[PDB]
Structures are given as C-alpha cells and as structure tokens.
Amino acid sequence: MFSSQPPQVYNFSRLVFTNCNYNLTRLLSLFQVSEFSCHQVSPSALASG
Amino acid sequence: CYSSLTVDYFAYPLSMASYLRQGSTGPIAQFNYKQDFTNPTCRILAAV
Amino acid sequence: DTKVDDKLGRCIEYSLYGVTGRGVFQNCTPVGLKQQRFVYDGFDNLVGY
Amino acid sequence: PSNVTIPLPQSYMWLTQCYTNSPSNSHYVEAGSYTPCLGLASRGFNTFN
Amino acid sequence: IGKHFISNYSAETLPFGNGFVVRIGFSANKTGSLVISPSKVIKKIYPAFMLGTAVTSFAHGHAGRYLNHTLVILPESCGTSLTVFYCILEPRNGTRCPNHQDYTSYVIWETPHSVNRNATLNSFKVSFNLRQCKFMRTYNISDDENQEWFGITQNAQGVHLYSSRKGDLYGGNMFLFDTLPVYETLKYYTVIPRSLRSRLNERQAWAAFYVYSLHKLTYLLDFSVDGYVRRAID
Amino acid sequence: DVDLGPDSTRDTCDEVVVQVSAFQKDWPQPIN
Numbered sequence A: 001m002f003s004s005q006p007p008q009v010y011n012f013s014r015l016v017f018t019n020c021n022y023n024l025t026r027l028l029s030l031f032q033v034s035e036f037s038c039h040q041v042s043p044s045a046l047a048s049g
Numbered sequence B: 001c002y003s004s005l006t007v008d009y010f011a012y013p014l015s016m017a018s019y020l021r022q023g024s025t026g027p028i029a030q031f032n033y034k035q036d037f038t039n040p041t042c043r044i045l046a047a048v
Numbered sequence C: 001d002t003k004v005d006d007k008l009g010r011c012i013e014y015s016l017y018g019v020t021g022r023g024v025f026q027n028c029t030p031v032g033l034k035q036q037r038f039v040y041d042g043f044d045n046l047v048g049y
Numbered sequence D: 001p002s003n004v005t006i007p008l009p010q011s012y013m014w015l016t017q018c019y020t021n022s023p024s025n026s027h028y029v030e031a032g033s034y035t036p037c038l039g040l041a042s043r044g045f046n047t048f049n
Numbered sequence E: 001i002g003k004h005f006i007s008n009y010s011a012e013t014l015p016f017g018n019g020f021v022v023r024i025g026f027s028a029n030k031t032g033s034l035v036i037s038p039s040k041v042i043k044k045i046y047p048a049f050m051l052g053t054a055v056t057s058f059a060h061g062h063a064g065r066y067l068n069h070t071l072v073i074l075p076e077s078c079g080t081s082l083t084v085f086y087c088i089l090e091p092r093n094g095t096r097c098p099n100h101q102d103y104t105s106y107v108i109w110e111t112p113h114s115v116n117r118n119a120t121l122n123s124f125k126v127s128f129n130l131r132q133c134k135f136m137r138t139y140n141i142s143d144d145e146n147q148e149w150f151g152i153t154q155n156a157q158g159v160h161l162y163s164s165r166k167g168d169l170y171g172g173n174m175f176l177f178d179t180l181p182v183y184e185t186l187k188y189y190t191v192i193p194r195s196l197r198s199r200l201n202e203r204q205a206w207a208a209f210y211v212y213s214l215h216k217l218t219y220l221l222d223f224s225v226d227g228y229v230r231r232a233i234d
Numbered sequence F: 001d002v003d004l005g006p007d008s009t010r011d012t013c014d015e016v017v018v019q020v021s022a023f024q025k026d027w028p029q030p031i032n
C-alpha cells in the first residue's frame, strides 16, 4: 500500500490477510479519516476482536 | 419539556468530525471522550 | 497465554486462536480432525478443541 | 497528511460510461469486481483523451 | 526419441464457472494398453492447467491464446513438485512456435533421463515468454500411487487450491493448502498437453484424470467419528 | 515482479503429432 502510487477506482488493488497480526493504531495514525460507514460490524469491534 | 438537561461542550475541530461518531476507534473515542447512550442524547457540531 | 489445566470443569472465558467465547472445559478422548483445531455440532457451536 | 507515506499519483481518474456500440448496451460493474472496460480505461483520461 | 504424441487439448477453452475438481490416479495399479501402441502397469500422472480471463486466436487463426495475466499450474521434478505462477505469456516466433505458420499445438515435456527440478518450466519457456510475473509458489508432493483429488475455486479472497493429500491421503476429502492473489475473475481453463520422452525400455502407461465442474449445490455429508466424510447425498 | 529466469535460447519449438482418435477411449467415472 505504501511502496508505489495508489491506483484508480476502476483499477482497485486488493489485499487479503490471513494468519497474521497487524498494528492497527500505526495504520490509522497515518490517515486523517473524514468519513466511515460500516455494515454489520463496528470499528471498535474490528480493533477489539 | 424534560426533567433534566445536561450539556457537555468543548472546543473541537471540524476536520475530526468522524472521530466523534459512534463506533469510532480513533484517539478521541479511546482516550478523550466516549459518548454515553443510556439517556436520549444528541451530539451537535457547530461553528461560532 | 494462559493454561486450562487449572480451570477445568468450571465456566471460563476462552480465546482460542482468535475464537472467543465462554464455556466449560474437560479433558476428553480426541475426536474429529486435529489439523482443523475446532470441532462443531450441527448448530454451529464449539464442542471441542 | 504526509506526502512521504504514499507516493502521489498524477490525477484522479474514473469511468463515466462503458458500453458496446450504443450507450443503451451499457456494461455495469458487479459487486466487488472489475469493470469490463478495464483495458480501455488503462489508457487513462486526461485533457486530450 | 520421436515426435510428441498428444491430443488437441489445447485450443479447448472450457468455461471456468465456479471451478472444478480433478480425480487423479484412478486405476494407478492395474494394466492398460499404450495409446501410441494399442500394455503395462498404469501409473499416476498429474494434470497441468492454464487459467485466465480472456482468450483469443494465435497469429495465424489457431485458437487457444490466453491474453493478459494467466494462471499456470505445472507439475515439476517428475511428479514430485508443483509450481504455480501468474504471468503474461508472450508467444514466440520460432519455426514451430505459436507465432509461426508451422504451428499446431504447444506441449510441455519431461525427460526421465540429481533431479533438475526445472525441466517442465524450461519446456514451457520453449513455447512461451514469461513477462511481468506477479508470484511463483512451490509445493512438495510425496510420490506414491494412491488415488488423489485436486480442485480449484475462485472467490473474492482469491484463488483457492484444494488437495486430498493435506488431510485424507487414503480418502477423497479435499482440503485447502494455499490461496493465490488472483482477484480478476477467471473465465477459461485449458489442460496443457503433456508428453514423456522415455525410450522403448522406459515407456509406461499413465492414468487418465477426470475434470468435473463445480456448482452451488446443497449436500448431505455424513461425518465419521474421526471427522472424515465417507458418504454424501446430492 | 518476481524474476522467472532466462528466456529460452532455442530458435525452434518441438514437433508434435496431434492425433485425437487414439486418445478417444472411455473408462467412465461418474461422480457417486
């Protein structure tokens, strides 16, 4: 996600993660979030489970 | 009319409005202010 | 990491490789598949580990 | 916020139409899939194109 | 050693659909007649596949050309290793290569006579050029003569590969062993022709494999005490 | 992009016999 320039919306890139631990606070500290909309989940549950 | 009215007010930038919304996991909801939903409540963001 | 060799036979909370819940643990004879790590019933409940 | 976190692309581009022969025969993207006009949109959209 | 004896398995671009399952190694201990010489103890051979999203004809009207990034699955080390890679195939313009008039089919081959562990890939590179490869992965297969099952499905999380050797070596149950980062929807697959250039003293018979399409169905699976499925109902 | 080795130095692809009638043989294996 950080090595190269991001693609366009019609050419979206996909990352799938399995059997790993990721530093969510470090990921979120690099972005100024302006709007979010979750479905059948909450961001606190994503950070807690 | 209603029995009691409680107002919590603070200086807050409008660029971080998504951090005050329910369910958020940012620094504001984790270490600064978590909104209590026990009573009928409303959150207002405004400018002076 | 905490062990279960003390908390057998009573209601405890578990977090087994990300799977969370509460239940009662007891040493049993092995059934199911070892590699899948989880044994379920027909109602999608964890009955073995 | 920081331009060193992710390299900046040239511009934001997106598709407005994607059809065969006539606009009545439009091809719509599916949920979580790529557009049929991906190869055409790879050429980019700018002032001239 | 003479010319390769193959069928027209190329230029046959079957629809991928929901994926397919492959029955490998049936009748791997019986005796059957040679195809080139219509008899010996049959042995198990592994399929080689070629999956992509777009297909077209070759430079002179011959069908079976995969455009853009193509998922290629190849057995290696004489049925010991399996290599999967995701590249864009550029046809070559040799005397008998696909971008040339004298072209009928492409084939991969292994010379039985310290294993090189790269002969199949070299035989593939003889026919195609490999450019902009995203990933290459390798897997070990212990060589035996048991009947096996292999399958492929695609999903929003990528391409899933299922093998019986993971959990049920002596049964037919199929278990996932890798997930590939192929997110463009696969629409076509072809079975790559394979030949063995063994001498008359080293010739053998190879078991047929069967490819069955996969469909969204409800099944009634009977789970045994040890967790294996030995009985099902469609 | 992962490196997948040198390009083939050969200038001639191999010669193949495409016979289909020899391979038309049936040992039916339906899904049971």
Ligand SMILES: *[C@@H]1O[C@H](CO)[C@@H](O[C@@H]2O[C@H](CO)[C@@H](O[C@@H]3O[C@H](CO)[C@@H](O)[C@H](O)[C@@H]3O)[C@H](O)[C@H]2NC(C)=O)[C@H](O)[C@H]1NC(C)=O
Binding pocket: D038, D039, D040, D042, D043, E067, E068
């Ligand atoms: C999958 O592969 C096909 C090749 O068969 C790609 O189509 C080719 O895409 C290139 C790049 O967009 C095209 O080149 C362009 O040609 C125009 C003239 O038409 C020229 O003005 C541009 O400067 C550029 O050179 C090429 O024509 C085109 N060929 C065909 C037959 O469509 C396709 O883009 C690939 N798919 C993806 C998703 O990349």
Ligand SMILES: *[C@@H]1O[C@H](CO)[C@@H](O[C@@H]2O[C@H](CO)[C@@H](O[C@@H]3O[C@H](CO)[C@@H](O)[C@H](O)[C@@H]3O)[C@H](O)[C@H]2NC(C)=O)[C@H](O)[C@H]1NC(C)=O
Binding pocket: E025, E026, E027, E028, E029, E144, E145, E146, E147, E170
């Ligand atoms: C073709 O013949 C070979 C002869 O070696 C067959 O391989 C053998 O298959 C049997 C069962 O089909 C295997 O027995 C199993 O052994 C394990 C312990 O390793 C045991 O726990 C199981 O309950 C079962 O008895 C045997 O190991 C295996 N031998 C070798 C060397 O692979 C092969 O299955 C035959 N293929 C056919 C009939 O399609």
Ligand SMILES: *[C@@H]1O[C@H](CO)[C@@H](O[C@@H]2O[C@H](CO)[C@@H](O)[C@H](O)[C@H]2NC(C)=O)[C@H](O)[C@H]1NC(C)=O
Binding pocket: A023, A025, A026, A029
């Ligand atoms: C996840 O990333 C954060 C950074 O956002 C890490 O926090 C750093 O921790 C080290 C040592 O604990 C400090 O010296 C840094 O000052 C911290 N950075 C910030 C921005 O506070 C954190 O260690 C990482 N790992 C975990 C497990 O949270």
Ligand SMILES: *[C@@H]1O[C@H](CO)[C@@H](O[C@@H]2O[C@H](CO)[C@@H](O)[C@H](O)[C@H]2NC(C)=O)[C@H](O)[C@H]1NC(C)=O
Binding pocket: A004, A005, A006, A007, A008, A011, D038, D039, D041, D042
């Ligand atoms: C979608 O975006 C990716 C990345 O932005 C593009 O991948 C690049 O493609 C060019 C040439 O096609 C290569 O030179 C780069 O090395 C690639 N970068 C990465 C990170 O993969 C891709 O081409 C785009 N696809 C379309 C259809 O536009």
Ligand SMILES: *[C@@H]1O[C@H](CO)[C@@H](O[C@@H]2O[C@H](CO)[C@@H](O)[C@H](O)[C@H]2NC(C)=O)[C@H](O)[C@H]1NC(C)=O
Binding pocket: E116, E117, E118, E121, E136, F002, F003, F004, F005, F006
């Ligand atoms: C078999 O061939 C492959 C390429 O087709 C080799 O893989 C690459 O080899 C080059 C040359 O050493 C390396 O620079 C690359 O890093 C290799 N890519 C990989 C491993 O993904 C492979 O090494 C060859 N096998 C042997 C035993 O040499």
Ligand SMILES: CCCCC/C=C\C/C=C\CCCCCCCC(=O)O
Binding pocket: A024, A027, A028, A031, A033, A036, A043, A046, B018, B019, B023, B024, B025, B026
């Ligand atoms: C910045 C988003 C991308 C970060 C990297 C990608 C994925 C991380 C996955 C899950 C975390 C979801 C957090 C939801 C953010 C909205 C809440 C807020 O923070 O107000």
Ligand SMILES: *[C@@H]1O[C@H](CO)[C@@H](O)[C@H](O)[C@H]1NC(C)=O
Binding pocket: C005, C027, C028, C029
């Ligand atoms: C659990 O049971 C198994 C089999 O009965 C036995 O081998 C093992 O020692 C037991 N462990 C404990 C902690 O009781």
Ligand SMILES: *[C@@H]1O[C@H](CO)[C@@H](O)[C@H](O)[C@H]1NC(C)=O
Binding pocket: D003, D004
């Ligand atoms: C980011 O922007 C600053 C603003 O002046 C500039 O100095 C710096 O070179 C930029 N970095 C990159 C990588 O473009």
Ligand SMILES: *[C@@H]1O[C@H](CO)[C@@H](O)[C@H](O)[C@H]1NC(C)=O
Binding pocket: E008, E010, E011, E012, E063, F020
């Ligand atoms: C391959 O051969 C079979 C046998 O006749 C034939 O039915 C089929 O059409 C051939 N495939 C192509 C692409 O011609």
Ligand SMILES: *[C@@H]1O[C@H](CO)[C@@H](O)[C@H](O)[C@H]1NC(C)=O
Binding pocket: E091, E092, E093
């Ligand atoms: C043959 O192909 C190569 C690379 O694919 C190219 O450099 C060369 O010009 C081609 N020759 C002809 C005669 O087309």
Ligand SMILES: *[C@@H]1O[C@H](CO)[C@@H](O)[C@H](O)[C@H]1NC(C)=O
Binding pocket: E080, E140
């Ligand atoms: C098995 O895999 C290992 C790497 O895990 C590799 O070094 C080896 O060549 C493979 N094959 C055999 C026969 O060990």
